[PDB]
Amino acid sequence: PFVQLFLEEIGCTQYLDSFIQCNLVTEEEIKYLDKDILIALGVNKIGDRLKILRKSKSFQ
Fold first, then answer.
1. Contact of 43 with 33, CB cutoff 8 Å
2. How far apart are CA 55 and CA 60, in angstroms?
3. Beta carbons of 14 and 52 less than 8 angstroms apart
4. Which segments of the protein form a coiled coil according to its record?
């Protein structure tokens, strides 16, 4: 799924596991993720959080 493929661009699949923790499969919801939600998602790097939001925009 795109959720796993775009996240792979970060270079660390560990975050991919973070998405499984929330069980998020909708691509639009990725943009819906806020920096605070990413913390709950299971992300240990604040810089990567910015990458997820910016890369998600690339979807459109």
1. no
2. 10
3. no
4. none
